[PDB]
Nucleic acid binder design. Sequence first.
RNA 1: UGUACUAUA
Length: 363
Amino acid sequence: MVEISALPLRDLDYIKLATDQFGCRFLQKKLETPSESNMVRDLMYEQIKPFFLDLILDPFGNYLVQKLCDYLTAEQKTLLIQTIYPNVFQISINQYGTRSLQKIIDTVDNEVQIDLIIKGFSQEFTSIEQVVTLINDLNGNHVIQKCIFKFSPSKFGFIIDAIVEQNNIITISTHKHGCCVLQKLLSVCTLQQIFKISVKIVQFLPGLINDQFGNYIIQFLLDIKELDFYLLAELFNRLSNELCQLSCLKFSSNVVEKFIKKLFRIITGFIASDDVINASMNILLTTIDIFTVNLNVLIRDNFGNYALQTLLDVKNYSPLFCNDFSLKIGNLIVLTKELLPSIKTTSYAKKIKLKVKAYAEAT
RNA sequence: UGUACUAUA
């Protein structure tokens, strides 16, 4: 390597170097110098044109591509992407290739480069089942997320299609990495894109409602205000009959709890559309009803009690149709504190005692 | 008394 330093830049084997760890670490540190920078890449770039794909997937070549991304001309980077865009799948799913593609995305210079990458993710080159596979893959999901954060939501077509296709909403949402990807997508999606996916989520709701990851998807939606006129009715018109069961499961409890708190925030906040507010008021009383009925179960239940304490939490509904609320709540609380000795040993025995004591001093 | 955050020298 010391002798290569002596050799003029014209006569270096950049592929042989880049394939080598120490040989690659050498080439990087050269790019990190204004003296010997333009001369380096312009000879590197010329020698590697037919080998971009190789370098991207090479256990040591990828570090050079990433490094070269910070010094490439738009004219030169556009040509790299023109060469490897059909291969974005096998690149993204690769242990070494995922890193290269993320840097290319994070360093795009124009619409043309972006479109090419998008073009390679289209069904012309990459299938739906493969997109789904990328979303859930340990190396692939990092590439999708970069697309999600770097690209305008108008390019999200290939991702959206893979989600709304059949029952894939279970494949993605009920999966470690895929659950995180979907939330990232929904965090920057357009209003239309949120609705298009939200419909599908509603369709397969019973499978997402108590999944160890899917439940985070429902709660995520419950924070989007622009969904109140639709999601609020749909959850209740699909889950109200088993609300007792839903409150006594490890994951669904948290969605019910998130749900109850949303009804409070909307109603108290008014003191949002009147219909939404109105509909929230009927559901809440209907919510309270079921809990009053199943008190002798929910308060003794390992997960149910948490949902119960949330419904009773005066802090949530202190500013409090309002006539019937106090009767439903009163009846609920007035025979709840009648059950404290029935769970004397329990951890949360004295937790509710301070709650019923907080309702008396607010009424 | 109760749930997730990742992968190349």
